[PDB]
Scaffold this motif. Structure first.
Motif, PDB file in Angstrom:
ATOM      1  N   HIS A 188       5.650 103.978  31.817  1.00  0.00           N
ATOM      2  CA  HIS A 188       4.521 103.787  30.923  1.00  0.00           C
ATOM      3  C   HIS A 188       4.952 103.847  29.460  1.00  0.00           C
ATOM      4  CE1 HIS A 188       1.654 105.115  34.408  1.00  0.00           C
ATOM      5  NE2 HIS A 188       2.219 103.937  34.615  1.00  0.00           N
TER       6      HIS A 188
ATOM      7  N   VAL B 187       2.659 102.350  27.315  1.00  0.00           N
ATOM      8  CA  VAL B 187       1.876 101.382  28.069  1.00  0.00           C
ATOM      9  C   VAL B 187       0.450 101.919  28.192  1.00  0.00           C
ATOM     10  CG1 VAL B 187       1.591 100.294  30.327  1.00  0.00           C
ATOM     11  CG2 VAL B 187       3.874 100.463  29.260  1.00  0.00           C
ATOM     12  N   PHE B 188      -0.483 101.329  27.442  1.00  0.00           N
ATOM     13  CA  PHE B 188      -1.900 101.647  27.587  1.00  0.00           C
ATOM     14  C   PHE B 188      -2.437 101.114  28.908  1.00  0.00           C
ATOM     15  CE2 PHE B 188      -3.633 103.589  23.808  1.00  0.00           C
ATOM     16  CZ  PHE B 188      -2.588 103.477  22.928  1.00  0.00           C
ATOM     17  N   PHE B 189      -3.499 101.752  29.406  1.00  0.00           N
ATOM     18  CA  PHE B 189      -4.235 101.184  30.521  1.00  0.00           C
ATOM     19  C   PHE B 189      -4.725  99.799  30.133  1.00  0.00           C
ATOM     20  CE2 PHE B 189      -4.677 105.589  32.111  1.00  0.00           C
ATOM     21  CZ  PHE B 189      -4.461 105.379  33.461  1.00  0.00           C
ATOM     22  N   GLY B 190      -4.453  98.820  30.999  1.00  0.00           N
ATOM     23  CA  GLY B 190      -4.739  97.434  30.714  1.00  0.00           C
ATOM     24  C   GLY B 190      -3.557  96.633  30.213  1.00  0.00           C
ATOM     25  N   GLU B 191      -2.421  97.274  29.924  1.00  0.00           N
ATOM     26  CA  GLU B 191      -1.207  96.580  29.512  1.00  0.00           C
ATOM     27  C   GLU B 191      -0.274  96.374  30.706  1.00  0.00           C
ATOM     28  OE1 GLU B 191      -0.262  99.262  26.016  1.00  0.00           O
ATOM     29  OE2 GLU B 191       0.220  97.346  25.100  1.00  0.00           O
ATOM     30  N   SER B 192       0.728  95.521  30.516  1.00  0.00           N
ATOM     31  CA  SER B 192       1.741  95.264  31.538  1.00  0.00           C
ATOM     32  C   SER B 192       2.902  96.249  31.433  1.00  0.00           C
ATOM     33  CB  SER B 192       2.285  93.839  31.422  1.00  0.00           C
ATOM     34  OG  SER B 192       1.472  92.927  32.142  1.00  0.00           O
ATOM     35  N   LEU B 193       3.269  96.844  32.571  1.00  0.00           N
ATOM     36  CA  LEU B 193       4.401  97.750  32.631  1.00  0.00           C
ATOM     37  C   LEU B 193       5.674  97.043  32.167  1.00  0.00           C
ATOM     38  CD1 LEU B 193       2.365  99.422  34.300  1.00  0.00           C
ATOM     39  CD2 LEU B 193       4.276  99.967  35.840  1.00  0.00           C
TER      40      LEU B 193
ATOM     41  N   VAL C 122      -2.273 106.360  39.537  1.00  0.00           N
ATOM     42  CA  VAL C 122      -2.118 105.258  38.601  1.00  0.00           C
ATOM     43  C   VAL C 122      -1.240 104.204  39.255  1.00  0.00           C
ATOM     44  CG1 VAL C 122      -1.221 104.511  36.381  1.00  0.00           C
ATOM     45  CG2 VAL C 122      -2.501 106.663  36.560  1.00  0.00           C
ATOM     46  N   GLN C 123      -1.699 102.969  39.213  1.00  0.00           N
ATOM     47  CA  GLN C 123      -0.992 101.821  39.729  1.00  0.00           C
ATOM     48  C   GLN C 123      -0.420 100.986  38.588  1.00  0.00           C
ATOM     49  OE1 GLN C 123      -0.052 101.510  42.615  1.00  0.00           O
ATOM     50  NE2 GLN C 123      -1.614 102.073  44.131  1.00  0.00           N
ATOM     51  N   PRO C 124       0.652 100.226  38.832  1.00  0.00           N
ATOM     52  CA  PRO C 124       1.371 100.146  40.107  1.00  0.00           C
ATOM     53  C   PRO C 124       2.392 101.267  40.301  1.00  0.00           C
ATOM     54  CG  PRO C 124       2.340  98.629  38.563  1.00  0.00           C
ATOM     55  CD  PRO C 124       1.205  99.299  37.833  1.00  0.00           C
TER      56      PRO C 124
ATOM     57  N   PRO D 116       1.609  92.761  37.496  1.00  0.00           N
ATOM     58  CA  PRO D 116       0.452  93.669  37.542  1.00  0.00           C
ATOM     59  C   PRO D 116       0.456  94.685  36.396  1.00  0.00           C
ATOM     60  CG  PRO D 116       2.044  94.238  39.246  1.00  0.00           C
ATOM     61  CD  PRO D 116       2.511  92.945  38.647  1.00  0.00           C
ATOM     62  N   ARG D 117      -0.722  95.224  36.094  1.00  0.00           N
ATOM     63  CA  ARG D 117      -0.955  95.974  34.873  1.00  0.00           C
ATOM     64  C   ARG D 117      -1.324  97.411  35.197  1.00  0.00           C
ATOM     65  NH1 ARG D 117      -1.949  91.671  31.031  1.00  0.00           N
ATOM     66  NH2 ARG D 117      -2.423  93.336  29.496  1.00  0.00           N
ATOM     67  N   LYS D 118      -1.239  98.253  34.173  1.00  0.00           N
ATOM     68  CA  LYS D 118      -1.531  99.665  34.337  1.00  0.00           C
ATOM     69  C   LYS D 118      -3.015  99.851  34.607  1.00  0.00           C
ATOM     70  CE  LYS D 118      -1.106 103.845  32.006  1.00  0.00           C
ATOM     71  NZ  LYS D 118      -0.671 104.532  30.771  1.00  0.00           N
ATOM     72  N   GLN D 119      -3.333 100.463  35.742  1.00  0.00           N
ATOM     73  CA  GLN D 119      -4.700 100.559  36.217  1.00  0.00           C
ATOM     74  C   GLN D 119      -4.917 101.909  36.877  1.00  0.00           C
ATOM     75  OE1 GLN D 119      -6.470  96.223  37.181  1.00  0.00           O
ATOM     76  NE2 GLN D 119      -5.388  97.186  38.913  1.00  0.00           N
ATOM     77  N   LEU D 120      -6.111 102.469  36.696  1.00  0.00           N
ATOM     78  CA  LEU D 120      -6.469 103.670  37.430  1.00  0.00           C
ATOM     79  C   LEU D 120      -6.925 103.289  38.838  1.00  0.00           C
ATOM     80  CD1 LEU D 120      -7.935 106.509  35.164  1.00  0.00           C
ATOM     81  CD2 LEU D 120      -6.280 106.633  37.031  1.00  0.00           C
ATOM     82  N   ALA D 121      -7.240 104.294  39.647  1.00  0.00           N
ATOM     83  CA  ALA D 121      -7.589 104.046  41.042  1.00  0.00           C
ATOM     84  C   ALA D 121      -8.455 105.168  41.603  1.00  0.00           C
ATOM     85  CB  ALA D 121      -6.322 103.874  41.884  1.00  0.00           C
TER      86      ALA D 121
END
Ligand code: NAD
Ligand code: 3LX
Ligand code: ZN
Lengths: 298, 6
Positions: free
Chosen positions: A136, A182-188, A215-217, B1-6
């Motif tokens: 991140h 890496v903010f939520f909504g950005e690409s790793l 937290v994904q991925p 794929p992007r940083k996402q909660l779950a």
């Protein structure tokens, strides 16, 4: 292959330790998150009470998650930088668990550490870029957000910006300077994937520490390992088990549990206890004491 | 794929 053998003689910390000192186990991947830096004074996200998600009403905020979303950050970068001043630690001191990973590196067992943290404590403990995937990003560097110049600034520059409460803007073009997280909504980061495609082809043990695996991925990493790779979780609470309603993940308890181990407690304690079984306790004590002393002297 | 909660 995909055969689900049982490599540990018993699903306990002692079983993992004997496996770590056998010959089958030569490449170890750590997956770590904010739990391993809480005893360094950087609070959780989701831990009730301590975690940030309980402590952010004061931020004029329509959604306690928005302060880490890139969308919201583009519109209103001030609350993040205000929050960053609150949390910025007075002194950067990595934990026992951090130093356990540096012992892994020092003994040649560390193939990679995948961290969700941005606090740079892995580097201060002595893990190098070759050892680390900052999945991140990090606070350690910052960049002008303007595609035209992307000038880089060091943490020393970003820290003064945050402590002087002045929104960081680029000296060359006056655009916003954003820490390299890496903010939520950005690409790793790209390197996350190029490491993931190769590392998990021959890892012999996964060490999951201080992460809720939500937290994904990032959380999907535990399934990249081959089916016979033992997996140890050191965490306050069990995590990574498949939802009963929702390829799935950790299996500590079911009748067909065969390789997952959950040591519940403090990551510092769990790494202390694992190191004892390995004969590294004194080795771990001297290293932490020395490095804390060196840092305490700055 | 992007940083996402779950
Ligand atoms: N240090 C940091 O950089 C930091 C801090 C907070 C949040 N975040 C970010 O927010 C997201 C939160 O994800 P996460 O899973 O890593 O954090 P989380 O808040 O979702 O969960 C942390 C996990 O570690 C446990 N835990 C907390 N302290 C522990 C301790 N001393 N010992 C053992 N277990 C402990 C918690 O019970 C929890 O299971 C991440 O993506 C991260 O990038 C980072
Ligand atoms: C992915 S979930 C990134 C989340 C950002 C975490 C916010 C951390 C606050 C900054 C801590 C300051 C330490 C240098
Ligand atoms: Zn610029």
């Amino acid at each position: 292959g995909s055969q689900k053998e049982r490599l540990l003689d018993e699903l306990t910390l002692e079983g993992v330790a004997r496996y770590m000192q056998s010959q089958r186990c030569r490449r170890v991947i750590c997956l770590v998150g904010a739990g391993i830096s809480t005893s360094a004074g950087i609070p959780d996200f989701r831990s009730p009470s301590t975690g940030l998600y309980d402590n952010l009403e004061k931020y004029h905020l329509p959604y306690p998650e928005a302060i880490f979303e890139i969308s919201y950050f583009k519109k209103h970068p001030e609350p993040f930088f205000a929050l960053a001043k609150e949390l910025y630690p007075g002194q950067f001191k990595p934990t026992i668990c951090h130093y356990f990973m540096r012992l892994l590196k020092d003994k040649g067992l560390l193939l990679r550490c995948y961290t969700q943290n941005i606090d740079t404590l892995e580097r201060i403990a002595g893990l190098e870029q070759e050892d680390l995937v900052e999945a991140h990003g990090t606070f350690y560097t910052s960049h002008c957000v303007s595609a035209s110049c992307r000038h880089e600034y060091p943490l020393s520059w970003m820290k003064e910006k945050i402590f002087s409460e002045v929104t960081p803007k680029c000296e060359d073009c006056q655009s916003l300077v954003k820490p390299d997280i890496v903010f939520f909504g950005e690409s790793l980061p790209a390197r996350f994937f190029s490491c993931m495609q190769s590392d998990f082809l021959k890892v012999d043990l996964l060490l999951v520490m201080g992460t809720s695996l939500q937290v994904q991925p990032f959380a999907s990493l535990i399934s990249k390992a081959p089916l016979s790779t033992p997996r140890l979780l050191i965490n306050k609470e069990k995590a990574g088990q498949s939802d009963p309603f929702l390829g799935g993940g950790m299996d500590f308890d079911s009748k067909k549990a065969y390789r997952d181990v959950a040591w519940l407690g403090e990551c510092d304690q769990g790494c202390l206890a694992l190191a004892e079984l390995l004969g590294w306790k004194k080795e771990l004590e001297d290293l932490v004491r020395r490095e804390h002393a060196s840092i305490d002297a700055q | 794929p992007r940083k996402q909660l779950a």
